[PDB]
Amino acid sequence: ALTNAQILAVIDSWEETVGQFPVITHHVPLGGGLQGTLHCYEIPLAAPYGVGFAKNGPTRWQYKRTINQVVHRWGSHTVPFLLEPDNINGKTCTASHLCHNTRCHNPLHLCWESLDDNKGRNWCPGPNGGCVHAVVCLRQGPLYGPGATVAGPQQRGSHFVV
Amino acid sequence: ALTNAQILAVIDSWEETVGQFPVITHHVPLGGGLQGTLHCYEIPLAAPYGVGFAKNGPTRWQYKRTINQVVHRWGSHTVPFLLEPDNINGKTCTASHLCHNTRCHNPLHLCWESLDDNKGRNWCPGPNGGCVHAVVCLRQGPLYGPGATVAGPQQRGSHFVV
DNA sequence: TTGACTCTCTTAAGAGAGTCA
DNA sequence: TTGACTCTCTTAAGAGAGTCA
Ligand SMILES: [Mg+2]
Ligand SMILES: [Mg+2]
Ligand SMILES: [Zn+2]
Ligand SMILES: [Zn+2]
Ligand SMILES: [Zn+2]
Ligand SMILES: [Zn+2]
Numbered sequence: 599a600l601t602n603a604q605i606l607a608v609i610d611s612w613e614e615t616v617g618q619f620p621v622i623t624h625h626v627p628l629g630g631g632l633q634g635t636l637h638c639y640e641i642p643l644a645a646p647y648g649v650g651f652a653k654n655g656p657t658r659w660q661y662k663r664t665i666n667q668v669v670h671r672w673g674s675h676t677v678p679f680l681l682e683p684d685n686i687n688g689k690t691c692t693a694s695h696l697c698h699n700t701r702c703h704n705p706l707h708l709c710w711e712s713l714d715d716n717k718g719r720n721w722c723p724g725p726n727g728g729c730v731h732a733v734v735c736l737r738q739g740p741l742y743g744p745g746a747t748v749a750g751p752q753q754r755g756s757h758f759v760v
Numbered sequence: 761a762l763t764n765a766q767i768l769a770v771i772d773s774w775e776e777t778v779g780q781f782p783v784i785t786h787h788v789p790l791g792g793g794l795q796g797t798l799h800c801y802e803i804p805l806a807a808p809y810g811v812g813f814a815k816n817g818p819t820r821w822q823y824k825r826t827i828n829q830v831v832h833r834w835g836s837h838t839v840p841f842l843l844e845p846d847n848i849n850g851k852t853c854t855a856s857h858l859c860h861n862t863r864c865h866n867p868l869h870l871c872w873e874s875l876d877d878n879k880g881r882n883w884c885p886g887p888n889g890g891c892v893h894a895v896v897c898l899r900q901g902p903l904y905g906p907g908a909t910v911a912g913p914q915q916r917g918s919h920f921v922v
Numbered sequence: 923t924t925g926a927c928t929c930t931c932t933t934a935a936g937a938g939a940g941t942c943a
Numbered sequence: 944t945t946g947a948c949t950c951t952c953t954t955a956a957g958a959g960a961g962t963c964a
Contacts, residue, residue: 610916696913706915710909718907744893746874751867755775
């Protein structure tokens with residue numbers, strides 16, 4: 599809600615509830631042929647999810663609290679960042695999973711960045727493979743690799759140069 | 761159905777027409793602090809665009825030919841790949857700009873790959889910076905770099921471990 | 923047959939808000 | 944007040960199809 603105290607109270611209540619989610623150990627590529635372990639705090643697959651939580655999409659949830667007798671609601675991963683600017687260079691800030699695990703609500707696996715920065719982590723070589731993200735990746739992106747391109751650049755005649 | 765010969769004729773007329781688009785010289789990062797040059801064949805900003813071409817969106821065009829009284833139409837960047845498979849690993853193939861210049865129709869700047877592979881090139885370090893794409897990038901992706909993350913992983917209490 | 927417009931759709935990383943009990 | 948559902952939206956890489964003369 600409006601006051602800093604009320605916002606801290608929201609974050610604290612969210613942390614307490616999420617802190618009781620099941621802790622799931624995930625072994626992940628780090629890049630450079632190395633592997634690490636992440637501890638994700640995973641929201642349940644079906645109701646009940648936890649106090650204040652409700653599912654608005656297949657992998658979308660919202661956190662809800664009643665403050666000043668009114669309902670205040672946020673995207674479930676946005677709550678750690680309620681005291682942060684909501685935009686950067688005119689682009690909306692988004693909650694961004696460093697563990698690439700949407701059910702995870704561990705705030706140590708979340709950052710707050712443009713949707714472009716968010717997406718780009720999917721292809722990052724990872725913290726041991728050359729990640730240059732200023733807020734460092736926790737793992738190699740799930741889509742990192744050579745790709746599966748069907749056809750490369752080509753011409754039939756002689757009209758073009760690279 | 762169009763025969764192989766008719767499809768080749770479509771590709772050839774498309775190449776003829778695109779080859780008359782203005783050729784614009786761009787200096788681009790290759791990764792590793794090196795600079796290179798790309799020569800883009802850029803569709804005009806406004807009508808007329810060239811024989812067979814029409815704009816269906818701000819940065820979307822289509823190519824149209826009428827063959828034996830039947831109107832055929834294709835996405836304007838898909839024509840080089842009409843003799844290729846249209847899907848791979850269960851995913852639709854998409855025209856993918858290696859030059860990241862949507863107006864460019866240079867087929868030496870295009871490849872044919874999944875939308876995920878396509879998107880991921882935006883963050884690639886480039887052919888001189890560590891590109892691992894099997895069909896190699898022509899330049900460092902425009903979004904490569906440290907990013908502009910507003911807030912990193914953080915907790916107010918002690919409920920979580922990474 | 924052709925040009926120049928019009929409209930909506932897909933994907934996978936993210937969102938806001940309403941209807942009931 | 945709290946829970947459990949419903950709906951559509953945003954973005955930036957890509958698409959398909961209709962109307963009229
Ligand atoms: Mg993400
Ligand atoms: Mg692209
Ligand atoms: Zn996690
Ligand atoms: Zn990274
Ligand atoms: Zn180009
Ligand atoms: Zn690459």
